[PDB]
Design a binder for this molecule. Structure first.
Ligand code: HEM
Ligand SMILES: NC(=O)c1cc2cc(-c3ccncc3)ccc2n1CCN1CCNCC1
Ligand SMILES: [Cl-]
Ligand SMILES: [Cl-]
Ligand SMILES: [Cl-]
Length: 409
């Protein structure tokens, strides 16, 4: 038995509203790397199966991720915590995004979606996102101080999605609003926000975009997705709507929280910040993602009995891959608790473990991170925090809602 308080639940949103449970994860890696996380009736975050297996070692996370034939994303979705009284149908509706599908449905969709994340398509966004990163930093600097999350972290990830999809500038304001309103629904600051209605408006806008491109096909990603190839595979209008919802959801808070927590790490380690401003190493992005681990945990469901590192996982049981624990696995990383922007190799699982569902936007995220921190170094090299950050109440997402900083220093 690990040295934990009785009834500790690693998906408890009340934990992450206050802290990352780093020491509790380290105790599991030390005394029980695969530990049954029991859950009382009605306190399962929408799941009523009694609990889950906490997966805390990077090797075990990687094994689950590559064995998608056994560990299903579709059965219960990949998000391990919602509001306790969520209806089952609201969990299953997530199966319309490819993140919560299994093969062969997932395989078909990913093949089509791959057209949109080719090195070409992502690389073609570099110039506009650099210009936007410089403009964001310059505006924050001119403001002198403010909420780093809103003034520096929030916009560039949304502009990457907008620039990727070819969204007209006049529409990006409401698009960003809908994308942000699907967020942090478990936090009291956003308790009055309806993520269902926001998704419907995203789907409506996306489907109209697909209808415009059906009559006006140009050379852009959206056309390539809604244009049938030789084998006739393509995104239907509604599937494109679900793809945009996925991007607006997947490519938003995660990159944002990487930027905020990366700057928090720089503030806590000024020697690393001084090093970054001089050298600007591209390895910084991956260490920032390891340190930030924006997705604390995703889950899978065992479709058959499976033995994982001497532990018998039974059919139907959930496994929760705690990336936050794996990214600080003492047996994998040299000095895991050291923030080292020059860390290489850096085999973190912040983008998930290698497998069918590995983050398709990983290189877009790295580019966004590298560009915004170059802009921060260019325009506010002496920025200093004003007060402590406010964390997001979530059982699986690692979010910073607000962080007051002084750009002038
Ligand atoms: C630092 C930023 C990001 C982090 C930490 C992150 C993390 C993740 C994780 C953990 C997964 C699941 C891996 C698995 O289940 O094995 C994933 C998948 C995915 N990500 Fe990201 N992500 C980030 C940025 C982005 C961006 C910028 C985009 C798109 C613009 C994106 C789009 C997706 C999609 C579509 C999937 C589903 C892939 C599939 O199911 O086949 N992500 N991401
Ligand atoms: N801020 C949220 O809550 C939320 C954030 C988020 C991020 C991803 C993701 C990130 C990176 N790579 C792949 C996926 C997936 C789901 C995410 N979500 C769930 C929100 N979603 C709202 C409506 N109800 C169901 C849950
Ligand atoms: Cl194996
Ligand atoms: Cl928001
Ligand atoms: Cl990996």
């Amino acid at each position: 038995s690990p040295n934990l308080p009785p009834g500790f639940d690693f998906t408890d949103p009340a934990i992450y509203a206050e802290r990352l449970p780093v020491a509790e994860f380290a105790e599991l890696r030390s005394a029980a790397p695969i530990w049954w996380n029991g859950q009382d009736p009605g306190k399962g975050g929408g799941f009523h199966d009694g609990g889950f297996w906490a997966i805390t070692k990077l090797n075990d996370v990687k094994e689950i991720s590559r064995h998608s034939d056994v560990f299903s994303s579709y059965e219960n979705g990949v998000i391990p915590r919602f509001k306790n009284d969520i209806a089952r149908e609201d969990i299953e509706v997530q199966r319309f995004v490819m993140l919560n599908m299994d093969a062969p449905h997932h395989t078909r969709l990913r093949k089509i979606i791959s057209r949109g994340f080719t090195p070409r398509a992502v690389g073609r966004l570099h110039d506009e996102l650099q210009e936007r990163a410089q403009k964001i930093a310059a505006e924050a600097a001119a403001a002198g101080s403010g909420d780093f999350v809103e003034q520096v972290s929030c916009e560039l990830p949304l502009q990457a999605i907008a620039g990727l999809l070819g969204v007209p500038q006049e529409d990006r304001g409401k698009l960003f609003h809908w994308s942000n309103e699907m967020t942090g629904n478990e936090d009291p600051e956003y308790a009055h926000i309806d993520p269902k209605a926001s998704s419907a408006e995203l789907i409506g806008y996306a489907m109209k975009m697909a209808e415009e491109k059906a009559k006006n096909p140009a050379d852009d990603i959206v056309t390539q997705l809604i244009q049938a190839d030789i084998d006739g595979e393509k995104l239907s209008d509604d599937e494109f709507g679900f793809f945009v919802v996925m991007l607006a959801v997947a490519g938003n808070e995660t990159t944002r929280n990487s930027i905020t927590q990366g700057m928090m790490a720089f503030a806590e380690h000024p020697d690393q910040w001084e090093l970054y401003k001089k050298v600007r190493p591209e390895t910084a992005a991956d260490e920032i993602v390891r340190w930030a681990t924006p997705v604390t945990a995703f889950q899978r469901t065992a479709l058959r009995d499976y033995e994982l590192s001497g532990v018998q996982i039974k059919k139907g049981q959930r496994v929760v891959m705690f990336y936050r624990s794996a990214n600080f696995d003492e047996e994998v990383f040299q000095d895991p608790f050291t923030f080292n922007i020059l860390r290489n190799p850096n085999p973190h699982v912040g983008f998930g473990g290698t497998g069918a569902h590995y983050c398709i936007g990983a290189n877009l995220a790295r580019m966004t991170i590298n560009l915004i921190f170059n802009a921060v170094a260019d325009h506010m090299p002496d920025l200093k925090p004003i007060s402590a950050p406010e964390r997001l109440r979530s059982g699986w997402l690692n979010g910073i809602k607000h962080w007051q900083v002084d750009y002038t220093g």
